[PDB]
Amino acid sequence: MAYPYSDMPFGVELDTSTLGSFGLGGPQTQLQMQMPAVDVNAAASGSGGFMAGFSNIFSRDSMFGGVAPSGAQTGGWVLPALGIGQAVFGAIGANRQQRAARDQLAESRRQFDMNYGAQRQSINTNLEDRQRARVASNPTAYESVDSYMERNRIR
Amino acid sequence: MAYPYSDMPFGVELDTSTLGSFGLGGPQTQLQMQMPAVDVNAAASGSGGFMAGFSNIFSRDSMFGGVAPSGAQTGGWVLPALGIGQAVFGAIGANRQQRAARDQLAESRRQFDMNYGAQRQSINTNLEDRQRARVASNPTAYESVDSYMERNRIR
Amino acid sequence: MAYPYSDMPFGVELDTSTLGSFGLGGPQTQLQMQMPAVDVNAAASGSGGFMAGFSNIFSRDSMFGGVAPSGAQTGGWVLPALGIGQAVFGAIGANRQQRAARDQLAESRRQFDMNYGAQRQSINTNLEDRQRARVASNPTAYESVDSYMERNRIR
Amino acid sequence: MAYPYSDMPFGVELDTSTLGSFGLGGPQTQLQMQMPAVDVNAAASGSGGFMAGFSNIFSRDSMFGGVAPSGAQTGGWVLPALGIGQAVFGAIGANRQQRAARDQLAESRRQFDMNYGAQRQSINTNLEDRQRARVASNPTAYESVDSYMERNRIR
Secondary structure: OOOOOOHHHHHHHHOOOOOOOOOOOOOOOOOOOOOOOOOOOOOOHHHHOOOHHHHOOOOHHHHHOEEOOOOOEEOOOHHHHHHHHHHHHHHHHHHHHHHHHHHHHHHHHHHHHHHHHHHHHHHHHHHHHHHHHHHHHOOOOOOOHHHHHOOOOOO | OOOOOOOHHHHHHHOOOOOOOOOOOOOOOOOOOOOOOOOOOOOOOOOOOOOOOOOOOOOHHHHHOEEOOOOOEEOOOHHHHHHHHHHHHHHHHHHHHHHHHHHHHHHHHHHHHHHHHHHHHHHHHHHHHHHHHHHHHOOOOOOOHHHHHHHOOOO | OOOOOOOHHHHHHHOOOOOOOOOOOOOOOOOOOOOOOOOOOOOOOOOOOOOOOOOOOOOHHHHHOEEOOOOOEEOOOHHHHHHHHHHHHHHHHHHHHHHHHHHHHHHHHHHHHHHHHHHHHHHHHHHHHHHHHHHHHOOOOOOOHHHHHHHOOOO | OOOOOOHHHHHHHHOOOOOOOOOOOOOOOOOOOOOOOOOOOOOOOOOOOOOOOOOOOOOHHHHHOEEOOOOOEEOOOHHHHHHHHHHHHHHHHHHHHHHHHHHHHHHHHHHHHHHHHHHHHHHHHHHHHHHHHHHHHOOOOOOOHHHHHHHOOOO
């Protein structure tokens, strides 16, 4: 476009993976960038054009609201901020619980698969040491090692 | 900025690790620093500008509030303090429960891993002793110990 | 400060340990001390300035409250006392339940560790008595006890 | 104090132990004593100053309450007595449940401690009867009983 910047490689790297991985549902794939400006300079000078540098509200009415005589009340931003934080933290907790459940299930699967692997190795070892006598005593009148090693071998 | 002080390496030292490790979600990474001034001197003199040594309210109505005739009541700080303490203690309890659950799961993982390690070392030494006699009896007519270790040894 | 008193050893000894150990969340770390004075002497004379020996209420209205005609009621201290007792006993019960759960978990840990230790000692006994015959039969063609206790010994 | 009485030995005796032991959370540590007097004699004469033998309510209004015309009702003692009984029985039930849980846990502990002791003693018997043959076969090339009873004896 007019100002491509460098978002295309970032989008390519992101691909279409969903939430998960290991960093509590999305790790810090990128790196920590440096500060944009040395001084506040009222945001980015003309480009920014913000009023936070000169606001200096320091007023309870803006934070916790206030009511003048004859009603006409105004509410501050503290309550909406608390609500937003509540929502975000509830979502984070739900994600954490789901991730913990997935972990536990994966751990159980690993446990069973690994126990089976150990038992299979043990059974195969028992089998080849049992057939060692057969193939060493009378090789001509008995079978060969390979016959068992790809016929009677535990998967 | 005009006054960097000594905060430049602090950010690099902290990196971006979240709460965890062993200090109940962050141990005493920093050290202990001597208290600046023996005498309060109204905080940092002109810089402080606080009423620590002048307010001295020593008033019972401030804590518990009070209502004058014709309404126009005021609330003391006791209720906000109680609410803040309630919130903090609830959060600490939730964090403690989460840490306990994580500790129990890691404990179970460790116990299973160490039990397997014991079983595996036992079976490996059993196989080593078993094949030692084979390699000692007919070295020419039997496989080498190195081959058995690299092919028939439990991982 | 002007009156440091002798609280520094208390702070040094206490450190930052939280509730736990064995004394239902903090045992009697300190010792017992005699009373400041045999006789009340109106609290600490001028320092006290109380009405312990002069109030002598001995009335039902102060304890159970009371309402005079035309509104203007007064509430006794019985309800606050009951509320405070309720809060304290609830906290004590919660602490007791947490301590019981911790004790049960620690008991399960001592259980598993002791069982593994016994089994490991039995296995080591079996191994060494099996290898004693090997090292006593033919010391030349067989291995030594050192090899077995350094690499064929269960931790 | 002016009237120390004999509470010091009891204060020394009870120490600071909490509810427990076997008597539903505190057994009958003390003993039985005779009544102060065969006849009531109006409580303790002047000290008592009660109406045990003079009140003689014998009326339904005192127990079940009653309301005269134009309001101005009075409540009987039956509701307070029922409330007090309710509270006492609830507390007793809670104590009983806690005691039952503690007893079950202690029973499980004794359960496994005794099972492990039996198994350990059986293992020790197996060990020493196996070692008896070794020490009786040839003492010159074998060890003594003390070495095996000290180094490889299950605790």
